Amino acid sequence: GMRDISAIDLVKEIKIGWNLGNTLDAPTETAWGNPRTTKAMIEKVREMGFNAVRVPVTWDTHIGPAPDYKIDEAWLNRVEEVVNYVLDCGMYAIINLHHDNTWIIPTYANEQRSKEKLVKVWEQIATRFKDYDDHLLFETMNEPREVGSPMEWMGGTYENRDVINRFNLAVVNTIRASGGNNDKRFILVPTNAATGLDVALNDLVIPNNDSRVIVSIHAYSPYFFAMDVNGTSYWGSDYDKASLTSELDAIYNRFVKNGRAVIIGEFGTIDKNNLSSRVAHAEHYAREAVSRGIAVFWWDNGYYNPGDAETYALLNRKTLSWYYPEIVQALMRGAG
């Protein structure tokens, strides 16, 4: 089930993906308004041209007490069931550990406590999925960071980034020792908050220089157009186009060009009654990333309410239709 394929070629194959957002990353699958996931939803995702689904998973409340930190089996089974929805559709799948920043605390004081817990949780996760083929990928952590800290969303301190390297190392060794195909499974790792900021990336170290490790970056660029409800609603100027291109070149010249694969696991825009800008923005984003060998995954939290904050949804899950197929088609145009 494990091809002789380099990470760089695997990521080119992945190309364009979709996040099952606000779902298993929620305290319970339906807690943030999304319906219980079905294979039918995933099929629609595949039907539109996506080649991969990222399945963010928050484990927090399903984790038993120390010292064993046993994961509730029912939760782990459900995670496995949804992963199979994706794989059965012939798509790639990524699972992670998402909003677990409550117990994953990247400071020197809390390093050993988190790391030990991080090791015992990943042992169980890696083990359950050890026999899956190379279409399943593990992402060590989502957006590891010191929550509530001054530098939280600005790359963190060296302390933060330093600890995160060891968290990653511990998870990577743990996966690699868990048997089955885990010696050869591809693994995504981020630095603080999965930022793409260059001076932060300076301190990222690839665990064991493992050749099947992929840089994980999240980039909702440009921030004001994409995330901020009070930001501008237009995107499309010559400056907008040159800007993201220059951002990708930085990523391409630093990693890809030298044989390190990169996945942009999250990007997207909210609904600001500005379809035309979103459609243009979406196409340029996929074209430029994929022409650089970078795979991109849209953030879809299932939330639709035009003009409101956090309105990233493309798929209408309860009705199996698309709110904005125009955006989906734009992505596909770009990825080619």
mmCIF file of C-alpha atoms in Angstrom:
data_model
loop_
_atom_site.group_PDB
_atom_site.id
_atom_site.type_symbol
_atom_site.label_atom_id
_atom_site.label_comp_id
_atom_site.label_asym_id
_atom_site.label_seq_id
_atom_site.Cartn_x
_atom_site.Cartn_y
_atom_site.Cartn_z
ATOM 1 C CA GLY A 1 0.000 0.000 0.000
ATOM 2 C CA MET A 2 3.092 2.187 0.242
ATOM 3 C CA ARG A 3 4.379 3.333 -3.162
ATOM 4 C CA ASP A 4 7.973 4.320 -3.865
ATOM 5 C CA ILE A 5 7.007 7.991 -4.074
ATOM 6 C CA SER A 6 8.759 11.079 -2.779
ATOM 7 C CA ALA A 7 6.786 13.578 -0.656
ATOM 8 C CA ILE A 8 7.147 16.190 -3.430
ATOM 9 C CA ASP A 9 5.390 13.968 -5.954
ATOM 10 C CA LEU A 10 2.769 12.873 -3.453
ATOM 11 C CA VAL A 11 1.829 16.482 -2.708
ATOM 12 C CA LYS A 12 1.550 17.314 -6.452
ATOM 13 C CA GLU A 13 -0.878 14.427 -6.697
ATOM 14 C CA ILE A 14 -2.956 15.699 -3.784
ATOM 15 C CA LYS A 15 -3.263 19.107 -5.435
ATOM 16 C CA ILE A 16 -6.546 20.420 -4.032
ATOM 17 C CA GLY A 17 -8.418 19.383 -0.900
ATOM 18 C CA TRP A 18 -11.316 20.244 1.408
ATOM 19 C CA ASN A 19 -11.567 20.505 5.225
ATOM 20 C CA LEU A 20 -14.370 18.939 7.194
ATOM 21 C CA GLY A 21 -14.300 21.986 9.493
ATOM 22 C CA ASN A 22 -16.175 22.552 12.791
ATOM 23 C CA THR A 23 -16.994 18.875 12.936
ATOM 24 C CA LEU A 24 -14.693 16.383 14.667
ATOM 25 C CA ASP A 25 -12.665 19.412 15.781
ATOM 26 C CA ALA A 26 -15.818 20.415 17.723
ATOM 27 C CA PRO A 27 -16.328 18.999 21.270
ATOM 28 C CA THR A 28 -18.830 16.593 19.679
ATOM 29 C CA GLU A 29 -19.585 16.133 15.973
ATOM 30 C CA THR A 30 -22.789 18.223 16.026
ATOM 31 C CA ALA A 31 -21.841 20.740 18.758
ATOM 32 C CA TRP A 32 -20.978 23.550 16.327
ATOM 33 C CA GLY A 33 -24.081 23.196 14.160
ATOM 34 C CA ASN A 34 -22.881 20.648 11.602
ATOM 35 C CA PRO A 35 -25.056 17.543 10.994
ATOM 36 C CA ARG A 36 -23.688 14.042 11.547
ATOM 37 C CA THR A 37 -21.317 13.463 8.640
ATOM 38 C CA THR A 38 -22.377 11.018 5.912
ATOM 39 C CA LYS A 39 -20.528 9.315 3.071
ATOM 40 C CA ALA A 40 -22.992 11.177 0.795
ATOM 41 C CA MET A 41 -21.515 14.555 1.807
ATOM 42 C CA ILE A 42 -18.030 13.310 1.115
ATOM 43 C CA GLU A 43 -19.130 11.974 -2.279
ATOM 44 C CA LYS A 44 -20.381 15.416 -3.272
ATOM 45 C CA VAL A 45 -17.044 16.844 -2.217
ATOM 46 C CA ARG A 46 -15.296 14.270 -4.470
ATOM 47 C CA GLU A 47 -17.833 14.789 -7.251
ATOM 48 C CA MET A 48 -16.710 18.423 -7.622
ATOM 49 C CA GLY A 49 -13.041 17.630 -8.252
ATOM 50 C CA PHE A 50 -11.436 17.656 -4.821
ATOM 51 C CA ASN A 51 -8.738 14.988 -4.410
ATOM 52 C CA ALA A 52 -8.443 15.021 -0.615
ATOM 53 C CA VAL A 53 -10.248 15.665 2.637
ATOM 54 C CA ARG A 54 -8.613 16.958 5.787
ATOM 55 C CA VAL A 55 -10.370 15.661 8.878
ATOM 56 C CA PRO A 56 -9.364 17.859 11.803
ATOM 57 C CA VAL A 57 -9.894 16.040 15.078
ATOM 58 C CA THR A 58 -10.028 17.468 18.590
ATOM 59 C CA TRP A 59 -9.393 14.737 21.150
ATOM 60 C CA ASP A 60 -9.501 16.756 24.431
ATOM 61 C CA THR A 61 -12.794 15.707 26.103
ATOM 62 C CA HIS A 62 -12.571 12.120 24.920
ATOM 63 C CA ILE A 63 -9.280 11.535 26.707
ATOM 64 C CA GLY A 64 -9.263 9.582 29.941
ATOM 65 C CA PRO A 65 -7.263 10.574 33.007
ATOM 66 C CA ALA A 66 -3.517 10.149 33.480
ATOM 67 C CA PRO A 67 -1.422 8.029 33.347
ATOM 68 C CA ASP A 68 -2.824 5.965 30.462
ATOM 69 C CA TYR A 69 -4.796 8.758 28.754
ATOM 70 C CA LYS A 70 -7.036 6.184 27.139
ATOM 71 C CA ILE A 71 -9.048 7.602 24.226
ATOM 72 C CA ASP A 72 -12.803 6.820 24.335
ATOM 73 C CA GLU A 73 -13.159 3.981 21.863
ATOM 74 C CA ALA A 74 -16.478 5.223 20.486
ATOM 75 C CA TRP A 75 -14.828 8.510 19.523
ATOM 76 C CA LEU A 76 -11.823 6.803 17.924
ATOM 77 C CA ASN A 77 -14.135 4.448 15.969
ATOM 78 C CA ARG A 78 -16.127 7.399 14.668
ATOM 79 C CA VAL A 79 -12.930 9.110 13.564
ATOM 80 C CA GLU A 80 -12.025 5.871 11.766
ATOM 81 C CA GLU A 81 -15.492 5.649 10.171
ATOM 82 C CA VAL A 82 -15.264 9.192 8.703
ATOM 83 C CA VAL A 83 -11.716 8.581 7.424
ATOM 84 C CA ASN A 84 -13.115 5.628 5.541
ATOM 85 C CA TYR A 85 -15.807 7.814 3.972
ATOM 86 C CA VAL A 86 -12.938 9.762 2.364
ATOM 87 C CA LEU A 87 -10.645 6.898 1.395
ATOM 88 C CA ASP A 88 -13.503 4.904 -0.077
ATOM 89 C CA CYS A 89 -14.185 7.860 -2.381
ATOM 90 C CA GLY A 90 -10.610 7.410 -3.617
ATOM 91 C CA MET A 91 -9.377 10.644 -2.028
ATOM 92 C CA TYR A 92 -6.424 11.350 0.233
ATOM 93 C CA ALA A 93 -7.159 11.865 3.941
ATOM 94 C CA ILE A 94 -5.360 13.799 6.676
ATOM 95 C CA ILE A 95 -6.121 13.446 10.390
ATOM 96 C CA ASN A 96 -4.649 15.505 13.165
ATOM 97 C CA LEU A 97 -4.909 16.736 16.663
ATOM 98 C CA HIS A 98 -6.637 20.062 16.457
ATOM 99 C CA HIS A 99 -8.088 22.245 19.257
ATOM 100 C CA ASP A 100 -6.051 20.459 21.911
ATOM 101 C CA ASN A 101 -4.213 23.581 22.984
ATOM 102 C CA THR A 102 -5.798 23.197 26.440
ATOM 103 C CA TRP A 103 -3.287 20.452 27.243
ATOM 104 C CA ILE A 104 -0.703 21.024 24.541
ATOM 105 C CA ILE A 105 1.184 23.959 25.963
ATOM 106 C CA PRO A 106 4.469 24.815 24.205
ATOM 107 C CA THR A 107 6.378 26.390 27.125
ATOM 108 C CA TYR A 108 9.425 25.088 28.988
ATOM 109 C CA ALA A 109 7.425 24.658 32.225
ATOM 110 C CA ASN A 110 4.702 22.590 30.597
ATOM 111 C CA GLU A 111 6.824 20.744 28.047
ATOM 112 C CA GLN A 112 7.113 17.417 29.870
ATOM 113 C CA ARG A 113 3.472 17.291 30.910
ATOM 114 C CA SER A 114 2.127 17.958 27.445
ATOM 115 C CA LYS A 115 4.755 15.836 25.636
ATOM 116 C CA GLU A 116 4.097 12.770 27.758
ATOM 117 C CA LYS A 117 0.372 13.181 27.143
ATOM 118 C CA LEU A 118 0.989 13.912 23.476
ATOM 119 C CA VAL A 119 2.982 10.646 23.211
ATOM 120 C CA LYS A 120 0.353 8.439 24.790
ATOM 121 C CA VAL A 121 -2.476 9.923 22.699
ATOM 122 C CA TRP A 122 -0.580 9.539 19.410
ATOM 123 C CA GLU A 123 0.489 5.958 20.250
ATOM 124 C CA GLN A 124 -3.195 4.997 20.212
ATOM 125 C CA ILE A 125 -3.975 7.078 17.131
ATOM 126 C CA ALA A 126 -0.949 5.865 15.133
ATOM 127 C CA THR A 127 -1.674 2.291 16.160
ATOM 128 C CA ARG A 128 -5.352 2.255 15.114
ATOM 129 C CA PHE A 129 -4.402 3.468 11.653
ATOM 130 C CA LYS A 130 -1.092 1.602 11.230
ATOM 131 C CA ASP A 131 -2.302 -0.657 8.398
ATOM 132 C CA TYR A 132 -3.848 2.026 6.120
ATOM 133 C CA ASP A 133 -2.129 2.793 2.800
ATOM 134 C CA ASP A 134 -0.277 5.954 1.816
ATOM 135 C CA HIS A 135 -3.522 7.859 1.087
ATOM 136 C CA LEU A 136 -3.873 8.458 4.782
ATOM 137 C CA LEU A 137 -1.582 11.061 6.272
ATOM 138 C CA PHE A 138 -0.907 12.089 9.837
ATOM 139 C CA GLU A 139 -0.529 15.753 10.856
ATOM 140 C CA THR A 140 1.274 15.975 14.216
ATOM 141 C CA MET A 141 -0.543 19.092 15.577
ATOM 142 C CA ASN A 142 -2.886 21.769 14.182
ATOM 143 C CA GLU A 143 -1.880 25.239 15.297
ATOM 144 C CA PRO A 144 0.400 24.687 18.299
ATOM 145 C CA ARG A 145 0.847 27.901 20.217
ATOM 146 C CA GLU A 146 0.742 29.481 23.676
ATOM 147 C CA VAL A 147 -2.936 30.412 23.922
ATOM 148 C CA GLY A 148 -3.501 33.875 25.351
ATOM 149 C CA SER A 149 0.108 34.926 24.921
ATOM 150 C CA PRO A 150 1.181 38.281 23.452
ATOM 151 C CA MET A 151 2.887 36.584 20.467
ATOM 152 C CA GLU A 152 0.251 33.878 19.936
ATOM 153 C CA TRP A 153 -0.738 34.969 16.438
ATOM 154 C CA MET A 154 2.576 36.587 15.564
ATOM 155 C CA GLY A 155 4.791 33.493 15.427
ATOM 156 C CA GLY A 156 5.297 33.052 19.170
ATOM 157 C CA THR A 157 8.573 33.401 21.082
ATOM 158 C CA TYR A 158 11.660 31.265 20.562
ATOM 159 C CA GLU A 159 10.481 29.379 23.645
ATOM 160 C CA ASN A 160 7.266 28.440 21.857
ATOM 161 C CA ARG A 161 8.935 27.365 18.645
ATOM 162 C CA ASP A 162 11.659 25.482 20.464
ATOM 163 C CA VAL A 163 9.196 23.342 22.425
ATOM 164 C CA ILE A 164 7.059 22.689 19.359
ATOM 165 C CA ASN A 165 10.075 21.119 17.584
ATOM 166 C CA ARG A 166 10.342 18.546 20.390
ATOM 167 C CA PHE A 167 6.585 17.903 20.463
ATOM 168 C CA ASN A 168 6.910 17.184 16.735
ATOM 169 C CA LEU A 169 9.974 15.019 17.214
ATOM 170 C CA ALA A 170 8.262 13.025 19.923
ATOM 171 C CA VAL A 171 5.173 12.503 17.802
ATOM 172 C CA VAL A 172 7.213 11.577 14.717
ATOM 173 C CA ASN A 173 9.315 8.989 16.586
ATOM 174 C CA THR A 174 6.103 7.709 18.197
ATOM 175 C CA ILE A 175 4.382 7.212 14.815
ATOM 176 C CA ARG A 176 7.504 5.649 13.278
ATOM 177 C CA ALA A 177 7.691 3.041 16.071
ATOM 178 C CA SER A 178 4.018 2.037 16.074
ATOM 179 C CA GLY A 179 4.250 -0.674 13.396
ATOM 180 C CA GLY A 180 2.487 -1.511 10.130
ATOM 181 C CA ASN A 181 2.968 1.188 7.483
ATOM 182 C CA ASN A 182 3.824 3.862 10.013
ATOM 183 C CA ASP A 183 7.510 3.528 9.159
ATOM 184 C CA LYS A 184 6.632 4.878 5.754
ATOM 185 C CA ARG A 185 3.503 7.097 6.278
ATOM 186 C CA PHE A 186 3.763 10.764 5.284
ATOM 187 C CA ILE A 187 3.465 13.245 8.157
ATOM 188 C CA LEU A 188 2.699 17.006 8.253
ATOM 189 C CA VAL A 189 4.436 19.203 10.852
ATOM 190 C CA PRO A 190 3.954 22.938 11.665
ATOM 191 C CA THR A 191 5.750 25.513 13.747
ATOM 192 C CA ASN A 192 3.876 27.980 15.994
ATOM 193 C CA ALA A 193 0.229 28.356 14.891
ATOM 194 C CA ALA A 194 1.150 26.715 11.559
ATOM 195 C CA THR A 195 2.312 30.176 10.536
ATOM 196 C CA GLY A 196 4.041 30.812 7.239
ATOM 197 C CA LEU A 197 5.956 33.745 8.670
ATOM 198 C CA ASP A 198 9.543 33.364 7.503
ATOM 199 C CA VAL A 199 11.373 34.327 10.710
ATOM 200 C CA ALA A 200 9.263 31.765 12.573
ATOM 201 C CA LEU A 201 9.997 29.084 10.016
ATOM 202 C CA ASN A 202 13.678 29.757 10.687
ATOM 203 C CA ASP A 203 13.379 27.758 13.889
ATOM 204 C CA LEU A 204 11.403 24.805 12.554
ATOM 205 C CA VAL A 205 13.447 21.601 12.453
ATOM 206 C CA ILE A 206 12.412 18.562 10.459
ATOM 207 C CA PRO A 207 12.462 15.680 12.983
ATOM 208 C CA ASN A 208 15.314 13.305 12.180
ATOM 209 C CA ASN A 209 15.477 15.011 8.720
ATOM 210 C CA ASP A 210 12.758 12.441 7.917
ATOM 211 C CA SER A 211 12.411 12.566 4.138
ATOM 212 C CA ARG A 212 8.632 11.916 4.178
ATOM 213 C CA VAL A 213 7.845 14.886 6.397
ATOM 214 C CA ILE A 214 5.878 17.734 4.879
ATOM 215 C CA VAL A 215 5.828 21.344 5.965
ATOM 216 C CA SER A 216 2.372 22.268 7.194
ATOM 217 C CA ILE A 217 1.395 25.886 6.735
ATOM 218 C CA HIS A 218 -1.895 27.730 7.140
ATOM 219 C CA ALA A 219 -2.301 30.908 5.105
ATOM 220 C CA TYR A 220 -5.568 32.832 4.883
ATOM 221 C CA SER A 221 -3.971 35.526 2.744
ATOM 222 C CA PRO A 222 -4.664 38.306 2.441
ATOM 223 C CA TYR A 223 -5.963 38.586 5.993
ATOM 224 C CA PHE A 224 -8.240 41.631 5.637
ATOM 225 C CA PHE A 225 -9.963 40.428 2.491
ATOM 226 C CA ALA A 226 -10.178 36.802 3.612
ATOM 227 C CA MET A 227 -10.941 36.687 7.344
ATOM 228 C CA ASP A 228 -11.948 40.101 8.598
ATOM 229 C CA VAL A 229 -15.659 41.013 8.339
ATOM 230 C CA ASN A 230 -14.669 44.680 8.522
ATOM 231 C CA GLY A 231 -11.818 44.296 6.010
ATOM 232 C CA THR A 232 -12.235 45.269 2.342
ATOM 233 C CA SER A 233 -14.558 43.217 0.171
ATOM 234 C CA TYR A 234 -12.571 43.629 -3.030
ATOM 235 C CA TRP A 235 -9.662 41.508 -4.193
ATOM 236 C CA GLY A 236 -8.228 41.552 -7.701
ATOM 237 C CA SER A 237 -5.787 44.414 -8.209
ATOM 238 C CA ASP A 238 -2.304 43.951 -9.690
ATOM 239 C CA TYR A 239 -0.934 44.478 -6.190
ATOM 240 C CA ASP A 240 -3.164 41.700 -4.777
ATOM 241 C CA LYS A 241 -1.921 39.309 -7.428
ATOM 242 C CA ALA A 242 1.766 40.155 -7.014
ATOM 243 C CA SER A 243 1.450 39.984 -3.243
ATOM 244 C CA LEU A 244 0.353 36.361 -2.778
ATOM 245 C CA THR A 245 2.651 35.257 -5.645
ATOM 246 C CA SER A 246 5.595 36.761 -3.759
ATOM 247 C CA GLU A 247 4.446 34.979 -0.587
ATOM 248 C CA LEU A 248 4.370 31.655 -2.418
ATOM 249 C CA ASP A 249 7.738 32.238 -3.995
ATOM 250 C CA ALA A 250 9.209 32.577 -0.521
ATOM 251 C CA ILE A 251 7.718 29.234 0.438
ATOM 252 C CA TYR A 252 8.755 27.674 -2.920
ATOM 253 C CA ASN A 253 12.369 28.940 -2.860
ATOM 254 C CA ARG A 254 12.885 27.866 0.761
ATOM 255 C CA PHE A 255 11.323 24.398 0.877
ATOM 256 C CA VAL A 256 10.015 22.913 -2.355
ATOM 257 C CA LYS A 257 12.962 23.991 -4.486
ATOM 258 C CA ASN A 258 15.220 22.030 -2.134
ATOM 259 C CA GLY A 259 13.053 18.932 -1.914
ATOM 260 C CA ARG A 260 10.877 19.672 1.131
ATOM 261 C CA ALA A 261 7.153 19.250 0.350
ATOM 262 C CA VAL A 262 4.708 21.846 1.686
ATOM 263 C CA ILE A 263 0.999 21.597 2.422
ATOM 264 C CA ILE A 264 -1.194 24.608 2.957
ATOM 265 C CA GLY A 265 -3.722 22.783 5.103
ATOM 266 C CA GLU A 266 -6.044 25.793 5.549
ATOM 267 C CA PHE A 267 -7.012 28.849 3.502
ATOM 268 C CA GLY A 268 -10.219 30.503 2.390
ATOM 269 C CA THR A 269 -12.444 33.579 2.538
ATOM 270 C CA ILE A 270 -15.604 34.515 4.406
ATOM 271 C CA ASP A 271 -18.842 35.555 2.677
ATOM 272 C CA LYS A 272 -18.884 39.352 2.311
ATOM 273 C CA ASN A 273 -21.513 39.604 -0.421
ATOM 274 C CA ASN A 274 -18.532 39.744 -2.767
ATOM 275 C CA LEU A 275 -18.765 36.551 -4.854
ATOM 276 C CA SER A 276 -16.783 37.980 -7.783
ATOM 277 C CA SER A 277 -13.790 38.809 -5.583
ATOM 278 C CA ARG A 278 -13.958 35.429 -3.871
ATOM 279 C CA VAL A 279 -14.127 33.604 -7.203
ATOM 280 C CA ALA A 280 -11.109 35.462 -8.588
ATOM 281 C CA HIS A 281 -9.252 35.077 -5.309
ATOM 282 C CA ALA A 282 -9.895 31.367 -5.246
ATOM 283 C CA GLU A 283 -8.630 30.714 -8.759
ATOM 284 C CA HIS A 284 -5.380 32.679 -8.383
ATOM 285 C CA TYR A 285 -4.685 30.911 -5.063
ATOM 286 C CA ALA A 286 -4.927 27.374 -6.437
ATOM 287 C CA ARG A 287 -3.083 28.147 -9.703
ATOM 288 C CA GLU A 288 -0.100 29.745 -8.056
ATOM 289 C CA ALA A 289 0.271 27.119 -5.312
ATOM 290 C CA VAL A 290 -0.137 24.099 -7.536
ATOM 291 C CA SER A 291 2.171 25.558 -10.211
ATOM 292 C CA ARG A 292 4.695 25.507 -7.342
ATOM 293 C CA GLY A 293 3.900 21.945 -6.268
ATOM 294 C CA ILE A 294 1.974 23.079 -3.180
ATOM 295 C CA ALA A 295 -1.343 21.439 -2.298
ATOM 296 C CA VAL A 296 -4.105 23.631 -0.848
ATOM 297 C CA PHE A 297 -7.094 22.687 1.317
ATOM 298 C CA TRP A 298 -10.174 24.947 1.660
ATOM 299 C CA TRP A 299 -11.480 25.616 5.174
ATOM 300 C CA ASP A 300 -15.227 24.674 5.197
ATOM 301 C CA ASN A 301 -16.859 24.981 8.624
ATOM 302 C CA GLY A 302 -20.350 24.366 7.268
ATOM 303 C CA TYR A 303 -21.498 27.891 8.266
ATOM 304 C CA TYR A 304 -23.591 29.859 5.769
ATOM 305 C CA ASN A 305 -24.986 33.313 6.579
ATOM 306 C CA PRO A 306 -23.963 35.922 3.963
ATOM 307 C CA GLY A 307 -22.231 38.968 5.409
ATOM 308 C CA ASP A 308 -21.537 37.417 8.803
ATOM 309 C CA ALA A 309 -18.170 36.542 10.263
ATOM 310 C CA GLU A 310 -16.640 33.049 9.769
ATOM 311 C CA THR A 311 -18.789 32.279 6.737
ATOM 312 C CA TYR A 312 -16.427 29.852 5.017
ATOM 313 C CA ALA A 313 -18.961 27.233 3.934
ATOM 314 C CA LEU A 314 -19.100 26.022 0.321
ATOM 315 C CA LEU A 315 -21.014 22.795 0.889
ATOM 316 C CA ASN A 316 -24.604 22.838 2.201
ATOM 317 C CA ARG A 317 -24.358 19.617 4.170
ATOM 318 C CA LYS A 318 -27.996 19.141 5.139
ATOM 319 C CA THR A 319 -29.183 19.409 1.524
ATOM 320 C CA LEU A 320 -26.183 18.030 -0.433
ATOM 321 C CA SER A 321 -25.962 21.099 -2.640
ATOM 322 C CA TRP A 322 -23.401 23.869 -2.919
ATOM 323 C CA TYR A 323 -23.990 27.393 -1.653
ATOM 324 C CA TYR A 324 -21.147 28.610 -3.851
ATOM 325 C CA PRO A 325 -20.301 26.167 -6.685
ATOM 326 C CA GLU A 326 -18.774 29.177 -8.454
ATOM 327 C CA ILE A 327 -16.007 29.201 -5.861
ATOM 328 C CA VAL A 328 -15.527 25.423 -6.145
ATOM 329 C CA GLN A 329 -15.261 25.571 -9.903
ATOM 330 C CA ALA A 330 -12.747 28.431 -9.567
ATOM 331 C CA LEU A 331 -10.497 26.266 -7.379
ATOM 332 C CA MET A 332 -10.699 23.484 -9.956
ATOM 333 C CA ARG A 333 -9.815 25.886 -12.773
ATOM 334 C CA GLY A 334 -6.711 26.915 -10.899
ATOM 335 C CA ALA A 335 -5.546 23.482 -9.841
ATOM 336 C CA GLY A 336 -6.023 22.268 -13.390
#
